């Protein structure tokens, strides 16, 4: 109902945003790991050294084993299963149950978190990149098709973990400015086209399909701003110029080790901004997102201030994860194929510098084909 919605998710520093559902009749309670950067609904389904609990299927009087398995590969870990299906509900999101896919997770490698106190993950991207193959539904699908939700979610998330998750609108008490809104390029991964990424204003000077070598996508299920090989060096060698005046590991930039200071006098204002120019809706137009060192300098678990650096390469193309996601307001508007974002009402604070979804700018392409 909105407010009802508001604050529905929780999550440790770092180890990702869930929302508690329920599966089954009767209802068995999991967090569930919000991920836009995939397409499948999967739940530990079997003990496991970091699962305080799990779906049994025999405990439900409405589970319909598929017959089928499932494999699926991220970034990180990987797990496989059985397929199936289920009655799932969002105690803190829409007042609807729907019969959904259900992946039962049997064996996992490198997937859970210890303490992160999820058990499953919400793959919220589009059909054609569900595994096994695009015939298998994805939950939100579900959802849209089954009963009156609107074909679009919107995700607050916080960081200083909490935040928020419109399912079917948008809940204007928790954004300021305005909306701006850039095109999802295909319905995959959310993809979407960068057409600038400015250094404290300096011009990466790169051709812009070079930010979007092979794609560009917005995962709220990654925790890095990951960039292209090319991209991502010219960014680094920037950030370690723009703050030399200090001492740093050299595997600190490649994110294997921490950087510290003491409490409250952490050198923010040598860290750069970082502004990526999102592709607008229409001709030649732009905006932009402002991102600062709050937000790709992660802070680290003594009582020193520590912080890991959160912008990593990546070979398969740009990834806006939470470094990126945490600050704004962020609109998955399905039904008109297109991203909002607004600067958030948790963004960061810092007496001088601030966040921003700036716009609009101008033009003269920058896709990878
Ligand atoms: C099946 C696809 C939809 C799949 N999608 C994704 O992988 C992106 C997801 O967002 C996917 C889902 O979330 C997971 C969380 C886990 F703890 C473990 C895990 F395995 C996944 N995320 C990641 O892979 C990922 C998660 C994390 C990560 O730390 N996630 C935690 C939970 C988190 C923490 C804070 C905030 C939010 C989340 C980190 C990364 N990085 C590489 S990093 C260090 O930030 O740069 C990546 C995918 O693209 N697979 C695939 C990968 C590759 C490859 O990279 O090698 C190649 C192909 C291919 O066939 O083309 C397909």
Redesign the pocket.
């Given at each position: 109902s909105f407010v009802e919605m508001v604050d529905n998710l929780r999550?440790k520093?770092?180890?990702?945003?869930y929302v508690e559902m329920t599966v089954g009749s009767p209802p068995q309670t999991l967090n569930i790991?919000?991920?836009?950067?995939?397409?499948?609904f999967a739940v530990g389904a079997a003990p496991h050294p970091f699962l305080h609990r799990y779906y049994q299927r025999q405990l439900s009087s409405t589970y319909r084993d598929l017959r089928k398995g499932v494999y699926?590969?991220?970034?990180?870990?990987?797990?496989e299963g059985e397929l199936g299906t289920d009655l799932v509900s969002i105690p803190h999101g829409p007042n609807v149950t729907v019969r959904a896919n259900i992946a039962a997770i049997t064996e996992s490698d490198?997937?859970?978190?210890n303490g992160?106190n999820?058990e499953g993950?919400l793959?919220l991207?589009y059909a054609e990149?569900?595994?096994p193959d695009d015939s298998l539904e994805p939950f939100f699908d579900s959802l849209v098709k089954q009963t009156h939700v609107p074909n679009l979610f919107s995700l607050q998330?916080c960081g200083a973990?909490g935040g928020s998750m419109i399912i079917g609108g948008i809940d204007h008490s928790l954004y300021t400015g305005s909306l701006w809104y850039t095109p999802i390029r295909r319905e995959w991964?959310y993809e979407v086209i960068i057409v600038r990424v400015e250094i404290n204003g300096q011009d990466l000077k790169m051709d812009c399909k070079e930010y979007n070598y092979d794609k560009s996508?917005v995962?709220?299920?990654?925790?890095?701003?990951?960039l292209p090989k090319k991209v991502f060096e010219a960014a680094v060698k920037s950030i370690k110029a723009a703050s030399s005046t200090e001492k740093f590991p050299d595997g600190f930039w490649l994110?294997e080790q921490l950087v510290c200071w003491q409490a409250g006098t952490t050198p923010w204002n040598i860290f750069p901004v970082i502004s990526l120019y999102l592709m607008g809706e229409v001709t030649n137009q732009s905006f932009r997102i402002t991102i600062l060192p709050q937000q790709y300098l992660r802070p680290v678990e003594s009582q020193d201030d520590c912080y890991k650096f959160?912008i990593?390469?990546?070979?398969?193309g740009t990834?806006m994860?939470?470094?990126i996601m945490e600050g704004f307001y962020v609109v998955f508007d399905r039904a008109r194929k297109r991203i909002g974002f607004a600067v958030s009402a948790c963004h960061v604070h810092d007496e001088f510098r601030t966040a921003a979804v700036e716009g609009p700018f101008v033009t003269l392409d920058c896709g990878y084909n």
């Open positions: 999550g520093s770092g180890q990702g945003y790991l919000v991920d836009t950067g995939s397409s499948n699926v590969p991220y970034t990180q870990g990987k797990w490198k997937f859970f978190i992160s999820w993950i793959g991207a990149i569900a595994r998330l973990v991964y996508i995962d709220s299920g990654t925790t890095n701003l990951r994110g959160a990593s390469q990546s070979s398969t990834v994860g939470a470094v």
